[PDB]
């Protein structure tokens, strides 16, 4: 009974494009890129009241964030950046901005057909990651 309803569930990665290049742009080192690029995460999204939780589970790392839309939080990313994050809903798209060391990257999550599409942008580099229901 909220529009973020269509994100809720357990999702499995089914394709990735340009993710190594995105990770290079973000500053991820060689060994982490190689192992992280191999991961096939499940993304688990849940909502309880105003609090959204997004978990990523893979053989590389298990991560979890919980947040309220529009309210900044500190996040330690899977690649160990300490970032300040804000996630908003913009026309039905979850828009996640991470700020650190004068840099910024944006991760958009959207429902498209039966998929959850994740678009990650750092400067001119975009990666697209497609998830299906698990
Ligand atoms: O599919 C996705 N789900 C996520 O949470 C993303 C993963 C990231 C990442 C993970 C591990 C790593 O070593 C370096 C970056 S940053 C972009 C957002 S893409």
UniProtKB/Swiss-Prot annotation:
The modification N-acetylcysteine is found at residue 4. Pfam families: Lipocalin. Keywords: Acetylation, Cytoplasm, Lipid-binding, Nucleus, Phosphoprotein, Transport. Changing residue 25 to D: In a breast cancer sample; somatic mutation. It is found in: Cytoplasm; Nucleus. A motif (Nuclear localization signal) lies at residues 24-34. A fatty acid binds at residues 129-131. The modification Phosphotyrosine is found at residue 22. One of its GO terms (molecular function) is long-chain fatty acid transmembrane transporter activity. PROSITE patterns: FABP (PS00214). GO terms for biological process: brown fat cell differentiation; cellular response to lithium ion; cellular response to tumor necrosis factor; cholesterol homeostasis; fatty acid transport; long-chain fatty acid transport; negative regulation of DNA-templated transcription; positive regulation of cold-induced thermogenesis. Lipid transport protein in adipocytes. Binds both long chain fatty acids and retinoic acid. Delivers long-chain fatty acids and retinoic acid to their cognate receptors in the nucleus. Belongs to the calycin superfamily. Fatty-acid binding protein (FABP) family. Monomer. Homodimer. Interacts with PPARG. This is Fatty acid-binding protein, adipocyte. It comes from Homo sapiens.
């Amino acid at each position: 009974s909220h529009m973020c309803d269509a994100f809720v569930g357990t999702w499995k990665l089914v394709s990735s494009e340009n993710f190594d290049d995105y990770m290079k742009e973000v500053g991820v080192g060689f060994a982490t890129r190689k192992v992280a690029g191999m991961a096939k995460p499940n993304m688990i999204i849940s909502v309880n009241g105003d609090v959204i939780t997004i978990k990523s589970e893979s053989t590389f790392k298990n991560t979890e964030i919980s947040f309220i839309l529009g309210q900044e939080f500190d996040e330690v990313t899977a690649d160990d950046r300490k970032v300040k994050s804000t996630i908003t809903l913009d026309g039905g798209v979850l828009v996640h901005v991470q700020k650190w060391d004068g840099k910024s990257t944006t991760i958009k999550r959207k429902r498209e057909d039966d998929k959850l599409v994740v678009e990650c942008v750092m400067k001119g580099v975009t990666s697209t990651r497609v998830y299906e229901r698990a």
